[PDB]
């Protein structure tokens, strides 16, 4: 997802999706350690997605 698709979601759905993507990122990291993936940049994309999600959640929490 991109930043617009993230900001389109509601707070509860965004929360559930963030907890989903965190576990997905952990599994992806373990898999990349086991066997290097064809595209390592998927990990970086997931990491930045998690950061963007937390930023939006904080913006809503203090706005």
């Amino acid at each position: 997802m991109k930043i617009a698709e993230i900001k389109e979601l509601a707070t509860k759905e965004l929360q559930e999706r963030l907890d989903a993507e965190v576990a997905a990122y952990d599994q992806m990291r373990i898999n990349h350690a086991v066997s290097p993936l064809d595209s390592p940049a998927k990990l970086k994309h997931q990491r930045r997605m998690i950061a963007q999600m937390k930023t939006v959640l904080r913006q809503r929490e203090l706005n």
């Binding site: 952990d26 599994q27 990291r29 373990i30 350690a33 086991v34």
Partner: protein, 95 residues
Amino acid sequence: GIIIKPIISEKMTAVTEKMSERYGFRVSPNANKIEIKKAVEAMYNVKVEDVNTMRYDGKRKNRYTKSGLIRGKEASFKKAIVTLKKGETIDFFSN
């Protein structure tokens, strides 16, 4: 989040061949046994029977530049040997 990577080595391969319920992970140095058990259970949907831990200090290494030598060091880590319940398993090759 504390699980960094699994341990693939001859010793771990032999241990898993002899037990089949025993796996190894490299985890954060400051996680305790209960935290490791909960993280493994949440990540793999299994029942964890026992956790053994050992703390490894990182190796000191030499960084070689054009001029000469710089002393450096690798990061410290913790090894977690996890034994599951009878009949359970974890797959590292799949996915």
